[PDB]
Amino acid sequence: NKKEWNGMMGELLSGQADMIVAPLTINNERAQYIEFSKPFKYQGLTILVK
Amino acid sequence: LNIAVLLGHSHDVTERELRNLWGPEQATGLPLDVNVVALLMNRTDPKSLITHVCDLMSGARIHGLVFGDDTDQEAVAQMLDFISSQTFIPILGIHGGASMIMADKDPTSTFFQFGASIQQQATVMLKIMQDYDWHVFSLVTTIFPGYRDFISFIKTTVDNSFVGWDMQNVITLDTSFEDAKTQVQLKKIHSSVILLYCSKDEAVLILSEARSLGLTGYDFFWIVPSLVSGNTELIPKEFPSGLISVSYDDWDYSLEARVRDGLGILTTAASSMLEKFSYIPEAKASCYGQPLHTLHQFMVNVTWDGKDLSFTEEGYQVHPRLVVIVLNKDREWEKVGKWENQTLSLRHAVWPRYKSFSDCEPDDNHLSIVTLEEAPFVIVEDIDPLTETCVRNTVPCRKFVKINNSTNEGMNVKKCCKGFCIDILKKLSRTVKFTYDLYLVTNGKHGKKVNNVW
Amino acid sequence: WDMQNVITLDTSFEDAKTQVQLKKIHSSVILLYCSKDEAVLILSEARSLG
Amino acid sequence: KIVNIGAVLSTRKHEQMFREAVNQANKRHGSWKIQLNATSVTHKPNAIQMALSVCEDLISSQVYAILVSHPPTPNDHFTPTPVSYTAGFYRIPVLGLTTRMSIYSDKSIHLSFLRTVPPYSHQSSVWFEMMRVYNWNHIILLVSDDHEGRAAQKRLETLLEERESKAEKVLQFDPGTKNVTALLMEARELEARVIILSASEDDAATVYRAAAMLNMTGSGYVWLVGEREISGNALRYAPDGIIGLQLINGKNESAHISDAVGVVAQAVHELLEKENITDPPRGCVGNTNIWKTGPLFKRVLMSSKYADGVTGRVEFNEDGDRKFANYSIMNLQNRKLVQVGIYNGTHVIPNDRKIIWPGGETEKPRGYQMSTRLKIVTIHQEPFVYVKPTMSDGTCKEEFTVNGDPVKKVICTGPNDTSP
Amino acid sequence: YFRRQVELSTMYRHMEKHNYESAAEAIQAVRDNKLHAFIWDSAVLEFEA
Numbered sequence A: 001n002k003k004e005w006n007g008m009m010g011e012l013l014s015g016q017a018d019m020i021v022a023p024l025t026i027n028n029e030r031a032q033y034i035e036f037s038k039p040f041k042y043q044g045l046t047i048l049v050k
Numbered sequence B: 001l002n003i004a005v006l007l008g009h010s011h012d013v014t015e016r017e018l019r020n021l022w023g024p025e026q027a028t029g030l031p032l033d034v035n036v037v038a039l040l041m042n043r044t045d046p047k048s049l050i051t052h053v054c055d056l057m058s059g060a061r062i063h064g065l066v067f068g069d070d071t072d073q074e075a076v077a078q079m080l081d082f083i084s085s086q087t088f089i090p091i092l093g094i095h096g097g098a099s100m101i102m103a104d105k106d107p108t109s110t111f112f113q114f115g116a117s118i119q120q121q122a123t124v125m126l127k128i129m130q131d132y133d134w135h136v137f138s139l140v141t142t143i144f145p146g147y148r149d150f151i152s153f154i155k156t157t158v159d160n161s162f163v164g165w166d167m168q169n170v171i172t173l174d175t176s177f178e179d180a181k182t183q184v185q186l187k188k189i190h191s192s193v194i195l196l197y198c199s200k201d202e203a204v205l206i207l208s209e210a211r212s213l214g215l216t217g218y219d220f221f222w223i224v225p226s227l228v229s230g231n232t233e234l235i236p237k238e239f240p241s242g243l244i245s246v247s248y249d250d251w252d253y254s255l256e257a258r259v260r261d262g263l264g265i266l267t268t269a270a271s272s273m274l275e276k277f278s279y280i281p282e283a284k285a286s287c288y289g290q291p292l293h294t295l296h297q298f299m300v301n302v303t304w305d306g307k308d309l310s311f312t313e314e315g316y317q318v319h320p321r322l323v324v325i326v327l328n329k330d331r332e333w334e335k336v337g338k339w340e341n342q343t344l345s346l347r348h349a350v351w352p353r354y355k356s357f358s359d360c361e362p363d364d365n366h367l368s369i370v371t372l373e374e375a376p377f378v379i380v381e382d383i384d385p386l387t388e389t390c391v392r393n394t395v396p397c398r399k400f401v402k403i404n405n406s407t408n409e410g411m412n413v414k415k416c417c418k419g420f421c422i423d424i425l426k427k428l429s430r431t432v433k434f435t436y437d438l439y440l441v442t443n444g445k446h447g448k449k450v451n452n453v454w
Numbered sequence C: 001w002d003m004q005n006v007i008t009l010d011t012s013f014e015d016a017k018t019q020v021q022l023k024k025i026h027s028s029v030i031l032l033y034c035s036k037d038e039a040v041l042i043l044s045e046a047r048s049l050g
Numbered sequence D: 001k002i003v004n005i006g007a008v009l010s011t012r013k014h015e016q017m018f019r020e021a022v023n024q025a026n027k028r029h030g031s032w033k034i035q036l037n038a039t040s041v042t043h044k045p046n047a048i049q050m051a052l053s054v055c056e057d058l059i060s061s062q063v064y065a066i067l068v069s070h071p072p073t074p075n076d077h078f079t080p081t082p083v084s085y086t087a088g089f090y091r092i093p094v095l096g097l098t099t100r101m102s103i104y105s106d107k108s109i110h111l112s113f114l115r116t117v118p119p120y121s122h123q124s125s126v127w128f129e130m131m132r133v134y135n136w137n138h139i140i141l142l143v144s145d146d147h148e149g150r151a152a153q154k155r156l157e158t159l160l161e162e163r164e165s166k167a168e169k170v171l172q173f174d175p176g177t178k179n180v181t182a183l184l185m186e187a188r189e190l191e192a193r194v195i196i197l198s199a200s201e202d203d204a205a206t207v208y209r210a211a212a213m214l215n216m217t218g219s220g221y222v223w224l225v226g227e228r229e230i231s232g233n234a235l236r237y238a239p240d241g242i243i244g245l246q247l248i249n250g251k252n253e254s255a256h257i258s259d260a261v262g263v264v265a266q267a268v269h270e271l272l273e274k275e276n277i278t279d280p281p282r283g284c285v286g287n288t289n290i291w292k293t294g295p296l297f298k299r300v301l302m303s304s305k306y307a308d309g310v311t312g313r314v315e316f317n318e319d320g321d322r323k324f325a326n327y328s329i330m331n332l333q334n335r336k337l338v339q340v341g342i343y344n345g346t347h348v349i350p351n352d353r354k355i356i357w358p359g360g361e362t363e364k365p366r367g368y369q370m371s372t373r374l375k376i377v378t379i380h381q382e383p384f385v386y387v388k389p390t391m392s393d394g395t396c397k398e399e400f401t402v403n404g405d406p407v408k409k410v411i412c413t414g415p416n417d418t419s420p
Numbered sequence E: 001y002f003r004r005q006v007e008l009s010t011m012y013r014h015m016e017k018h019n020y021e022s023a024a025e026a027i028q029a030v031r032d033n034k035l036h037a038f039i040w041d042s043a044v045l046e047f048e049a
């Protein structure tokens, strides 16, 4: 009855990785567990249509 | 092999039906040296228990022990664990303290029980709470063991909940009550239900305190497991009317059927292990002056006569028959709900409240609210088919849907509701502080006086 | 202004309902109106209740 | 006209001083007008007849607290279980004296089984105090067993929650195997050298042979073990310079049981201060009426405060153990135990000796490397992470931009597709 | 981020039926008119525009 992680966090927290350089979607859930960095890119959200 | 079945006085079970429990049974007998020993005993003290265990183990190497306890001592089964740590014989605890919710077994133990763990029973009770939408709930626990995993499972369920449960911190009872600070904790009650986890005499004390203080109202419901309620042959004093209990001791599926299923599982495991290994009878010689081919990792996926009686890794049944009972004003325990192998069936769909429980009772705070489906205002959709949960910005409703045109019978189908007037009613319930009873009209449209008939 | 509702005390404390009324207080400024010895008792209970 | 005190006891001079402690308890509280008697049972290897002797000598005795006093048993099971299992039939607390296992520290199986010793997990707190001595954060945990290992891991998680920090890597495995050397090489690949070990004797000998095989006893390594790892061949196979613990008055059996009998006697006289004194019923003949002053006796015993003791200020905690015991910190200098520290209730005091480490100097090895090699992982992002297969074998097509700048590439490793 | 917010449950239930593995899957799907819209970071969609 416990939630876990996967992906880049699942490979980082397992010790298989050391540092993640990626388009890290900064939120509040990940900051409760790991530490962040100061962002190099500033970017929001939008919708792509035809 | 040789199986000795001893009992006490539970369910008024005599001995002659145990003598008749072997004759027509085991018709295709590939084990040949199978004999049954039916015994009874008044004394349920551990001295006579060890005495009869040594007598039956010295009694021509009996490899099967079946016992049902009639007392309220679960540590007897732990005593059986000490028997399971010395005899190394497959032993089954059947009734009472031999099959209560015990704490933890051992890898060196070959003892098993009827029933499930406390986590599956907690899952059944939370499924009841999901089906009845009582999101306002309590958790009152004493220091009676088996509580850390239970409260931890509740916390991991609420922390991983797609429902949005409203939870207060755990009300804890340390010692025997002073009625000075534990009274404040009972006045720190979280509304709309009371969940309790304690022993039997602790349940007597807590229900006596709640009856003396008046914590048994129409809003404060009482939902308890079998470990709080106790055994079924005796019903103690000072119980509130409307005590929902979750147990597995059935009177229809009685003790004779349970010991017949236990004998069937033992003979099935013996006939399945005899075809693999030859020298199956291998037990301890005698208790005075102190095995590999065992049934510890062989009879896990056992099923006799289609009965869902597979074994767990913790020493329980995977999907046992759970029975949810209530208490009326006539001091009787009547079956209400049963549990399927994946779902939870509810016979009494219209949930009773058992109004004869106390002296004074108003029909306040619950307002009968009816509406009609209009697209910008009243959006009514089905519940989630995978989780059975309305999302918390929607509200439940019931609809009296008639089945077909010939019959007059109708069911109360519960459906989710979002929309404008839903938000209006929720903000009115935030401000005016009234609880809503939302349902739909089944007569038809809004309203018209059809010749002095509305 | 943000005025919490009026907490009323009848007499000397029962320690069954007065503690419940003092747990209702969540503000910063407590406006107490009683006698001198009742003020000593209420400050002693508030020190006991933190 | 007597009240019996039950003990599972071997040596007869200890029976004599046990009766002397009963006499010293009878000297005080002169207004108490009923007498005491002692009962003790000896070594029997057959545990069924041990439980038989327990149920024949303690049910018909009306005891208040039972003392099991056999540490050096030749059986490797080490089971004081039937005494507590017999006394839990009426919820009677047995005060243990010998073992420190988490299975006996459990409130779940054992209902109210107290003792006078703390479990080994508090040693991790002492190890956390070692984390307060050398100011070290990145730790490595290796536990052989799983019963005590879950409790030790939970206690270490509580300790790291108190700092609001986390461990680097924890490990549990099957006690008895030999090929955990790959996990030890993975621990060598970690950025710390704090080696915390929880193991039995054979598991400690196995990991010492694996450490000597992999040369894990060089410079920087922080070796720190408990009590089972300095006994038998684990005492022999330990490297010269390993740091171990020692229980003050742990192997001192006589003074510890004397202080325990003093605690038991003062708890009995404190229980007799109030009313509703119910004897344990004679359950041998048809009696299962439960001893309902069990939680009353637990309220007395779990709140029993003391100030006297040869071992020190003994007091029961929330689990019924020893509060704030002074410990010893030993070093293995050329296969010789050398005392290098003492431990207060919450503080470590090193003595004037030299803390000799298995690496170089006696100064503390800062085993936190600067992480020269790092590990980078990323997801295939289209404008960010262009992943392209090689031309022939491991080569990259060094192409230019529109301004003559070559695109600086890197050699990565990635899978073909998804798992289906 | 949309699962946290209290009124975005409807778009959550809409998007959970057609969850795609990579973003280029959604790019080719909206290119071949399999989709109609896609929630994504802004400058990456500007780059692909």
Ligand SMILES: *[C@@H]1O[C@H](CO)[C@@H](O[C@@H]2O[C@H](CO)[C@@H](O)[C@H](O)[C@H]2NC(C)=O)[C@H](O)[C@H]1NC(C)=O
Residues within 6 Å of the ligand: B306, B308, B339, B340, B341, B342
């Ligand atoms: C109890 O478990 C049994 C076995 O898993 C279920 O019986 C199966 O039901 C499905 C249809 O729902 C059939 O396709 C299988 O063939 C059945 N297996 C057998 C041999 O019984 C049963 O549905 C579960 N529910 C109950 C009645 O508790």
Ligand SMILES: *[C@@H]1O[C@H](CO)[C@@H](O[C@@H]2O[C@H](CO)[C@@H](O)[C@H](O)[C@H]2NC(C)=O)[C@H](O)[C@H]1NC(C)=O
Residues within 6 Å of the ligand: D178, D179, D180, D181, D182, D185
């Ligand atoms: C136990 O198992 C480990 C892991 O497989 C062994 O370590 C490797 O063994 C292989 C040969 O099987 C060697 O080629 C590697 O060089 C070893 N690893 C390293 C980095 O040393 C280990 O040898 C086994 N030990 C025993 C008991 O034989």
Ligand SMILES: *[C@@H]1O[C@H](CO)[C@@H](O)[C@H](O)[C@H]1NC(C)=O
Residues within 6 Å of the ligand: B009, B042, B043, B044, D286, D287, D288
């Ligand atoms: C023994 O038999 C009696 C008959 O009245 C019954 O009440 C009791 O539960 C049994 N158990 C004991 C105490 O031995």
Ligand SMILES: *[C@@H]1O[C@H](CO)[C@@H](O)[C@H](O)[C@H]1NC(C)=O
Residues within 6 Å of the ligand: B300, B301
């Ligand atoms: C028993 O069932 C479990 C779960 O399906 C499975 O893991 C195990 O392999 C089965 N054992 C047998 C008898 O094959």
Ligand SMILES: *[C@@H]1O[C@H](CO)[C@@H](O)[C@H](O)[C@H]1NC(C)=O
Residues within 6 Å of the ligand: B403, B404
């Ligand atoms: C009654 O209605 C249900 C659908 O609601 C249908 O499946 C069933 O066949 C109907 N029964 C009869 C006999 O009308």
Ligand SMILES: *[C@@H]1O[C@H](CO)[C@@H](O)[C@H](O)[C@H]1NC(C)=O
Residues within 6 Å of the ligand: B405
């Ligand atoms: C149902 O039965 C009634 C009987 O009068 C009939 O008028 C109606 O057409 C039937 N059809 C429906 C609405 O199911």
Ligand SMILES: *[C@@H]1O[C@H](CO)[C@@H](O)[C@H](O)[C@H]1NC(C)=O
Residues within 6 Å of the ligand: D002, D036, D037, D038, D039
């Ligand atoms: C104490 O009990 C033992 C038996 O356990 C008995 O031999 C002894 O005489 C008793 N002593 C007194 C005087 O109570």
Ligand SMILES: *[C@@H]1O[C@H](CO)[C@@H](O)[C@H](O)[C@H]1NC(C)=O
Residues within 6 Å of the ligand: D213, D214, D215, D218
């Ligand atoms: C110690 O063991 C390692 C294992 O790879 C080996 O490489 C090294 O040469 C050995 N000798 C030393 C330097 O201690």
Ligand SMILES: *[C@@H]1O[C@H](CO)[C@@H](O)[C@H](O)[C@H]1NC(C)=O
Residues within 6 Å of the ligand: D251, D252, D253, D254, D255
């Ligand atoms: C220490 O233990 C010994 C037994 O080895 C015991 O005789 C002595 O009383 C104990 N007390 C001291 C002196 O620390």
Ligand SMILES: *[C@@H]1O[C@H](CO)[C@@H](O)[C@H](O)[C@H]1NC(C)=O
Residues within 6 Å of the ligand: D274, D275, D276
């Ligand atoms: C002793 O028991 C009686 C009866 O239950 C009770 O009235 C009394 O308060 C108890 N004594 C104490 C000090 O609790």
Ligand SMILES: *[C@@H]1O[C@H](CO)[C@@H](O)[C@H](O)[C@H]1NC(C)=O
Residues within 6 Å of the ligand: D309, D310, D311, D312, D313, D325, D326, D344, D345
């Ligand atoms: C243990 O340490 C305390 C100080 O915390 C000291 O007072 C006491 O004497 C020590 N124990 C013994 C028995 O020497």
Ligand SMILES: *[C@@H]1O[C@H](CO)[C@@H](O)[C@H](O)[C@H]1NC(C)=O
Residues within 6 Å of the ligand: D344, D345, D346, D347, D349
């Ligand atoms: C004892 O523990 C205290 C806790 O404050 C600590 O300050 C002190 O250094 C320790 N040593 C002694 C024996 O005073």
